[PDB]
PDB file of C-alpha atoms in Angstrom:
ATOM      1  CA  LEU A   1      45.205 -10.630  42.257  1.00 45.89           C
ATOM      2  CA  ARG A   2      43.708  -7.241  41.421  1.00 47.22           C
ATOM      3  CA  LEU A   3      40.472  -5.549  42.422  1.00 47.22           C
ATOM      4  CA  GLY A   4      37.475  -6.954  40.522  1.00 46.10           C
ATOM      5  CA  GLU A   5      39.112 -10.339  39.958  1.00 45.38           C
ATOM      6  CA  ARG A   6      36.912 -13.385  40.630  1.00 49.90           C
ATOM      7  CA  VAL A   7      38.440 -15.717  43.199  1.00 49.12           C
ATOM      8  CA  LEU A   8      38.014 -18.705  45.427  1.00 49.91           C
ATOM      9  CA  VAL A   9      38.296 -18.321  49.177  1.00 48.78           C
ATOM     10  CA  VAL A  10      39.315 -21.320  51.225  1.00 50.83           C
ATOM     11  CA  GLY A  11      37.683 -21.715  54.606  1.00 53.16           C
ATOM     12  CA  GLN A  12      36.080 -24.031  57.105  1.00 55.30           C
ATOM     13  CA  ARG A  13      32.528 -24.365  58.302  1.00 54.13           C
ATOM     14  CA  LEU A  14      31.596 -26.025  61.581  1.00 55.05           C
ATOM     15  CA  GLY A  15      29.061 -28.867  61.434  1.00 58.34           C
ATOM     16  CA  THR A  16      27.923 -32.262  62.719  1.00 59.12           C
ATOM     17  CA  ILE A  17      28.361 -35.606  60.956  1.00 58.74           C
ATOM     18  CA  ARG A  18      24.963 -37.139  60.226  1.00 54.08           C
ATOM     19  CA  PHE A  19      25.974 -39.692  57.598  1.00 52.90           C
ATOM     20  CA  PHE A  20      28.780 -41.680  56.066  1.00 51.67           C
ATOM     21  CA  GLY A  21      28.421 -43.971  53.091  1.00 51.69           C
ATOM     22  CA  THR A  22      28.226 -44.400  49.339  1.00 49.39           C
ATOM     23  CA  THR A  23      25.857 -42.225  47.282  1.00 49.68           C
ATOM     24  CA  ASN A  24      24.255 -41.833  43.837  1.00 53.14           C
ATOM     25  CA  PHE A  25      25.779 -38.485  43.016  1.00 53.18           C
ATOM     26  CA  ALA A  26      29.334 -39.823  42.964  1.00 53.11           C
ATOM     27  CA  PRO A  27      31.738 -42.726  43.592  1.00 53.51           C
ATOM     28  CA  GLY A  28      33.524 -43.139  46.931  1.00 56.77           C
ATOM     29  CA  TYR A  29      32.502 -42.572  50.534  1.00 55.73           C
ATOM     30  CA  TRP A  30      30.877 -39.333  51.594  1.00 55.43           C
ATOM     31  CA  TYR A  31      30.131 -37.603  54.880  1.00 52.55           C
ATOM     32  CA  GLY A  32      26.787 -35.846  55.083  1.00 50.11           C
ATOM     33  CA  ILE A  33      27.080 -32.846  57.381  1.00 49.59           C
ATOM     34  CA  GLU A  34      24.601 -30.440  58.922  1.00 49.36           C
ATOM     35  CA  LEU A  35      26.138 -26.993  59.328  1.00 49.47           C
ATOM     36  CA  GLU A  36      25.186 -24.487  61.990  1.00 52.31           C
ATOM     37  CA  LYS A  37      24.354 -21.805  59.407  1.00 51.92           C
ATOM     38  CA  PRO A  38      22.406 -21.776  56.102  1.00 53.04           C
ATOM     39  CA  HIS A  39      25.683 -21.978  54.172  1.00 53.45           C
ATOM     40  CA  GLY A  40      25.017 -25.500  52.881  1.00 52.13           C
ATOM     41  CA  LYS A  41      23.624 -26.842  49.598  1.00 52.69           C
ATOM     42  CA  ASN A  42      20.839 -29.240  50.545  1.00 55.87           C
ATOM     43  CA  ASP A  43      18.430 -30.746  53.120  1.00 55.16           C
ATOM     44  CA  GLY A  44      20.214 -34.108  53.339  1.00 57.15           C
ATOM     45  CA  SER A  45      19.068 -35.300  49.944  1.00 56.74           C
ATOM     46  CA  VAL A  46      20.460 -34.870  46.479  1.00 58.31           C
ATOM     47  CA  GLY A  47      18.326 -35.147  43.365  1.00 58.31           C
ATOM     48  CA  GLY A  48      15.483 -36.576  45.403  1.00 57.26           C
ATOM     49  CA  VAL A  49      17.626 -39.304  46.973  1.00 54.05           C
ATOM     50  CA  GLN A  50      17.769 -38.983  50.789  1.00 53.50           C
ATOM     51  CA  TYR A  51      20.851 -39.779  52.873  1.00 54.86           C
ATOM     52  CA  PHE A  52      20.169 -37.854  56.096  1.00 55.43           C
ATOM     53  CA  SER A  53      17.581 -35.207  56.991  1.00 57.95           C
ATOM     54  CA  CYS A  54      18.049 -31.554  57.996  1.00 57.15           C
ATOM     55  CA  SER A  55      16.700 -28.088  57.172  1.00 54.63           C
ATOM     56  CA  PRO A  56      17.243 -26.777  53.613  1.00 56.90           C
ATOM     57  CA  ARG A  57      20.593 -25.062  53.073  1.00 56.50           C
ATOM     58  CA  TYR A  58      22.166 -26.486  56.257  1.00 55.87           C
ATOM     59  CA  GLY A  59      23.028 -29.777  54.622  1.00 55.36           C
ATOM     60  CA  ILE A  60      26.266 -30.552  52.873  1.00 55.09           C
ATOM     61  CA  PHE A  61      28.299 -33.523  51.607  1.00 56.50           C
ATOM     62  CA  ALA A  62      32.074 -33.821  51.592  1.00 58.52           C
ATOM     63  CA  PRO A  63      34.746 -36.485  51.001  1.00 61.66           C
ATOM     64  CA  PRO A  64      36.980 -37.693  53.872  1.00 62.56           C
ATOM     65  CA  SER A  65      39.850 -35.516  52.627  1.00 62.15           C
ATOM     66  CA  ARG A  66      37.854 -32.334  53.392  1.00 60.67           C
ATOM     67  CA  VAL A  67      36.514 -33.260  56.813  1.00 65.50           C
ATOM     68  CA  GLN A  68      38.483 -32.821  60.016  1.00 65.21           C
ATOM     69  CA  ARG A  69      37.733 -33.014  63.730  1.00 64.62           C
ATOM     70  CA  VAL A  70      37.566 -29.672  65.567  1.00 63.43           C
ATOM     71  CA  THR A  71      40.132 -30.972  68.047  1.00 63.32           C
ATOM     72  CA  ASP A  72      42.700 -31.292  65.186  1.00 61.58           C
TER      73      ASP A  72
ATOM     74  CA  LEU B   1      35.132 -39.614  62.954  1.00 61.46           C
ATOM     75  CA  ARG B   2      31.839 -41.074  64.161  1.00 59.92           C
ATOM     76  CA  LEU B   3      28.236 -40.010  63.690  1.00 57.88           C
ATOM     77  CA  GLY B   4      27.324 -37.031  65.893  1.00 53.33           C
ATOM     78  CA  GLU B   5      30.898 -35.745  66.053  1.00 54.55           C
ATOM     79  CA  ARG B   6      31.344 -31.992  65.517  1.00 52.16           C
ATOM     80  CA  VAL B   7      33.699 -31.224  62.647  1.00 52.61           C
ATOM     81  CA  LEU B   8      35.161 -28.653  60.339  1.00 51.43           C
ATOM     82  CA  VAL B   9      34.600 -28.925  56.611  1.00 51.79           C
ATOM     83  CA  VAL B  10      37.122 -27.353  54.288  1.00 53.11           C
ATOM     84  CA  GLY B  11      35.784 -25.761  51.137  1.00 51.49           C
ATOM     85  CA  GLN B  12      35.909 -22.850  48.752  1.00 53.65           C
ATOM     86  CA  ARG B  13      33.452 -20.095  48.021  1.00 55.60           C
ATOM     87  CA  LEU B  14      33.499 -18.078  44.811  1.00 55.67           C
ATOM     88  CA  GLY B  15      33.673 -14.286  45.140  1.00 55.37           C
ATOM     89  CA  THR B  16      35.034 -10.980  43.838  1.00 56.67           C
ATOM     90  CA  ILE B  17      37.886  -8.962  45.347  1.00 56.21           C
ATOM     91  CA  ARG B  18      36.621  -5.550  46.437  1.00 56.72           C
ATOM     92  CA  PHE B  19      39.450  -4.544  48.769  1.00 56.93           C
ATOM     93  CA  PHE B  20      43.022  -5.125  49.806  1.00 55.58           C
ATOM     94  CA  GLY B  21      44.740  -3.382  52.676  1.00 57.54           C
ATOM     95  CA  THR B  22      45.395  -3.139  56.392  1.00 55.71           C
ATOM     96  CA  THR B  23      42.481  -3.185  58.859  1.00 60.57           C
ATOM     97  CA  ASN B  24      41.527  -2.547  62.502  1.00 60.59           C
ATOM     98  CA  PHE B  25      40.412  -6.060  63.291  1.00 57.68           C
ATOM     99  CA  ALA B  26      43.873  -7.548  62.799  1.00 53.27           C
ATOM    100  CA  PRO B  27      47.503  -7.077  61.705  1.00 52.38           C
ATOM    101  CA  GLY B  28      48.616  -7.832  58.140  1.00 52.73           C
ATOM    102  CA  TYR B  29      47.020  -7.343  54.740  1.00 53.16           C
ATOM    103  CA  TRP B  30      43.489  -8.505  54.080  1.00 54.87           C
ATOM    104  CA  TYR B  31      41.329  -9.064  51.019  1.00 54.06           C
ATOM    105  CA  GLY B  32      37.710  -8.016  51.355  1.00 52.42           C
ATOM    106  CA  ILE B  33      35.544 -10.262  49.202  1.00 51.78           C
ATOM    107  CA  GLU B  34      31.916 -10.208  48.135  1.00 53.09           C
ATOM    108  CA  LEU B  35      30.579 -13.736  47.713  1.00 54.40           C
ATOM    109  CA  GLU B  36      27.820 -14.747  45.338  1.00 54.21           C
ATOM    110  CA  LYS B  37      25.721 -16.247  48.148  1.00 56.59           C
ATOM    111  CA  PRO B  38      24.752 -15.101  51.679  1.00 54.72           C
ATOM    112  CA  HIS B  39      27.480 -17.318  53.144  1.00 56.91           C
ATOM    113  CA  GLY B  40      29.607 -14.385  54.322  1.00 56.32           C
ATOM    114  CA  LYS B  41      29.975 -12.631  57.684  1.00 53.95           C
ATOM    115  CA  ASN B  42      29.522  -8.927  56.988  1.00 55.63           C
ATOM    116  CA  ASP B  43      28.503  -6.040  54.678  1.00 52.46           C
ATOM    117  CA  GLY B  44      32.063  -4.832  54.045  1.00 52.61           C
ATOM    118  CA  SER B  45      32.520  -3.362  57.494  1.00 51.45           C
ATOM    119  CA  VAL B  46      33.674  -4.818  60.762  1.00 47.30           C
ATOM    120  CA  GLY B  47      32.758  -3.312  64.112  1.00 45.82           C
ATOM    121  CA  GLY B  48      31.450  -0.210  62.395  1.00 48.60           C
ATOM    122  CA  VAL B  49      34.648   0.366  60.412  1.00 48.45           C
ATOM    123  CA  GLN B  50      34.023   0.239  56.633  1.00 45.74           C
ATOM    124  CA  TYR B  51      36.490  -1.201  54.119  1.00 47.57           C
ATOM    125  CA  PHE B  52      34.249  -1.948  51.123  1.00 48.46           C
ATOM    126  CA  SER B  53      30.463  -2.027  50.722  1.00 49.96           C
ATOM    127  CA  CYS B  54      28.143  -4.934  49.860  1.00 48.77           C
ATOM    128  CA  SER B  55      24.901  -6.551  51.040  1.00 45.93           C
ATOM    129  CA  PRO B  56      24.856  -8.063  54.560  1.00 42.02           C
ATOM    130  CA  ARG B  57      26.129 -11.640  54.742  1.00 45.09           C
ATOM    131  CA  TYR B  58      27.810 -11.526  51.306  1.00 45.07           C
ATOM    132  CA  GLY B  59      30.909  -9.831  52.634  1.00 42.17           C
ATOM    133  CA  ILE B  60      33.981 -11.598  53.895  1.00 44.10           C
ATOM    134  CA  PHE B  61      37.645 -10.922  54.719  1.00 48.25           C
ATOM    135  CA  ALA B  62      40.540 -13.311  54.217  1.00 47.36           C
ATOM    136  CA  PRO B  63      44.358 -13.262  54.306  1.00 46.53           C
ATOM    137  CA  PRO B  64      46.401 -13.777  51.103  1.00 49.75           C
ATOM    138  CA  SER B  65      47.107 -17.395  52.072  1.00 51.35           C
ATOM    139  CA  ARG B  66      43.390 -18.275  51.749  1.00 54.76           C
ATOM    140  CA  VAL B  67      42.621 -16.500  48.491  1.00 55.74           C
ATOM    141  CA  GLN B  68      43.295 -18.003  45.084  1.00 57.26           C
ATOM    142  CA  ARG B  69      42.403 -17.149  41.497  1.00 57.59           C
ATOM    143  CA  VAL B  70      39.735 -19.348  39.880  1.00 55.77           C
ATOM    144  CA  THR B  71      42.130 -20.048  37.015  1.00 55.48           C
ATOM    145  CA  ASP B  72      44.558 -21.740  39.489  1.00 56.75           C
TER     146      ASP B  72
END
């Protein structure tokens, strides 16, 4: 890992669960989460299909394997 | 994990290494990274102390354990 190298940084963002269920963008069950900061990718909808509703950029979707309670 | 519950979502952000070295904010060696999106926490400095320089919010710092090459 040298200077200039493109990388991926692993981290956690705090948010609130606003949805859990199947979706159109992918198989499986997904949590829809509203972050505290504009670090998200959507407003609760994906490709026009709504799942939950929040301000643009604060919305995000993640599989159970990437969601954990703060108290854990 | 019910609706309304506050949680932590684990994810990865893409970025470029712009620094590696010791710092004032904490012991150990830290990578300073400039993300592609305003999802960071600083402009390359922390508490007035500069390490690298980038636009506000695109800068972030992370320990070796949380940084990985894209090709991995």
